Amino acid sequence: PLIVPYNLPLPGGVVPRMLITILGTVKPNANRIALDFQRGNDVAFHFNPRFNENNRRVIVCNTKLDNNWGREERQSVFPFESGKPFKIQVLVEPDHFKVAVNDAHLLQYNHRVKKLNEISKLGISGDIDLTSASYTMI
Ligand SMILES: NC(=O)[C@@H]1O[C@H](CO)[C@@H](O)[C@H](O)[C@@H]1S[C@@H]1O[C@H](CO)[C@H](O)[C@H](O)[C@H]1O
Ligand SMILES: [Mg+2]
Ligand SMILES: [Mg+2]
Ligand SMILES: [Mg+2]
């Protein structure tokens, strides 16, 4: 597989119709997963499943600009389970990232960072065995 944390270059950043696919398996007794779509030091799209925040499972999304986190967007639908294989698909659409897990739509996150073609790396981290991470234009 791949060594976590893993950096996936996104050559020429992202653009609508670009689909990024992350395949792995959650470790037993997981605490967190994180995808970080970065524009340089900024994080355009942070997607952060938390397995135990006050004994609740929640996905936190956010953007970091000039080292400051913005307003979190939170989703209680939580498709991940400790120990189980998952697929995350992030499809760039004109106004948002659209995320589906295991072929089921999960959430969308409106673009706050506008220079899509400068979001040139995806960091993948957390309590997973990572199998593959790739992109394709659809
Ligand atoms: N920025 C913080 O330190 C906030 O701390 C609060 C109390 O622990 C939490 O309720 C907030 O979610 C964040 S934690 C911080 O969140 C950002 C996303 O907004 C990112 O997930 C960071 O890795 C995490 O430390
Ligand atoms: Mg279409
Ligand atoms: Mg923000
Ligand atoms: Mg911008």
Which sequence spans correspond to the domains of the chain? 6-137
Here the tokens at position 11 are: 């050559």
Resolution in A, one decimal?
1.8
Residue among 47, 69, 73 to mutate when testing ligand 1 (max atoms within 8 A of CB)? 69
**Per-residue burial over 82-97, b = 16 or more CB atoms within 10 Å of its CB, e = otherwise:** eeeebebbbbbeeeeb
Here the tokens at position 95 are: 């106004």
53 assigned to a ligand binding site: no
Please state the atom number of ligand 1 nearest to the C-alpha of residue 72.
Answer: 19
- Determination technique for this PDB entry? X-ray
End-to-end CA gap in the chain? 25
Q: Judge if the upstream peptide bond of residue 5 is cis by omega within 30 degrees of 0.
A: yes
Any idea which fold 6-137 has?
Jelly Rolls (2.60.120)
C-alpha 113/C-alpha 84 separation (Å) is: 32
Here the tokens at position 80 are: 């991940």
